[PDB]
Amino acid sequence: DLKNPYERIQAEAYDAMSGIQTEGTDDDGGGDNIGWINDGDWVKYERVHFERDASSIEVRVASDTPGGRIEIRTGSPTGTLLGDVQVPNTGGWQQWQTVTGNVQIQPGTYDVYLVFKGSPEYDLMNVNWFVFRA
Numbered sequence: 001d002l003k004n005p006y007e008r009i010q011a012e013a014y015d016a017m018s019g020i021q022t023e024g025t026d027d028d029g030g031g032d033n034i035g036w037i038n039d040g041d042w043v044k045y046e047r048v049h050f051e052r053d054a055s056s057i058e059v060r061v062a063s064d065t066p067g068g069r070i071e072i073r074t075g076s077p078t079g080t081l082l083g084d085v086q087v088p089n090t091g092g093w094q095q096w097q098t099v100t101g102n103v104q105i106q107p108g109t110y111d112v113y114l115v116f117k118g119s120p121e122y123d124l125m126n127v128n129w130f131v132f133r134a
């Protein structure tokens with residue numbers, strides 16, 4: 001029941017959430033994406049076990065708006081900030097790109113939260129999966 005951070009975690013495989021919804025994605029691979037994301041929403045992924053230090057994160061994302069950013073925290077949605085990535089407009093809700101942002105994560109078993117931040121005036125983005133790099 002540990003999750004491997006160095007292979008893809010599907011955004012839809014969350015253990016808790018606030019304010020989000022899932023739909024079938026068009027992206028390469030099939031499955032679902034999360035969506036209907038607004039400033040302040042989040043998703044929690046339990047038991048993410050890092051065996052080596054991570055220095056970046058890759059997120060598969062889409063946006064039909066000015067976009068927003070993804071905060072990586074642990075423990076809780078107001079837990080320590082380990083990194084972020086900004087998701088830009090990408091042309092569409094189903095126009096997928098892979099962004100990358102720096103993180104600093106020591107070895108450890110964490111509850112990983114992706115907290116979504118941006119303007120309250122529009123939905124921010126869709127997310128499909130993510131994976132870390134050492």
Ligand SMILES: OC[C@H]1O[C@@H](O[C@@H]2[C@@H](O)[C@H](O[C@@H]3[C@@H](O)[C@H](O[C@@H]4[C@@H](O)[C@@H](O[C@@H]5[C@@H](O)[C@H](O[C@@H]6[C@@H](O)[C@H](O)O[C@H](CO)[C@H]6O)O[C@H](CO)[C@H]5O)O[C@H](CO)[C@H]4O)O[C@H](CO)[C@H]3O)O[C@H](CO)[C@H]2O)[C@H](O)[C@@H](O)[C@@H]1O
Pocket residue numbers: 023034035036037064065066089090091092093094122123124125126
């Ligand atoms: O269908 C499933 C999906 O549903 C999603 O929910 C959406 C909901 O958010 C939407 O509400 C709209 C809202 O999105 C809109 O906000 C404006 C933004 O779109 C924003 O975007 C501009 C963007 O428009 C522009 O994009 C185009 C370009 O990229 C393209 O290639 O070409 C055309 C030219 O012909 C371009 O126009 O890109 C610019 C950057 O260059 C970007 O800033 O701009 C403004 C801010 O200025 C936002 O206000 O606003 C509307 C208010 O009227 C809302 O109606 O509604 C749809 C349909 O009802 C709804 O489905 C979920 O969030 C999602 O997860 C799910 O997948």
Ligand code: NA
Pocket residue numbers: 019020035036037038041
């Ligand atoms: Na939402």
Ligand code: NA
Pocket residue numbers: 010011012025030031032033127128129
């Ligand atoms: Na997915």
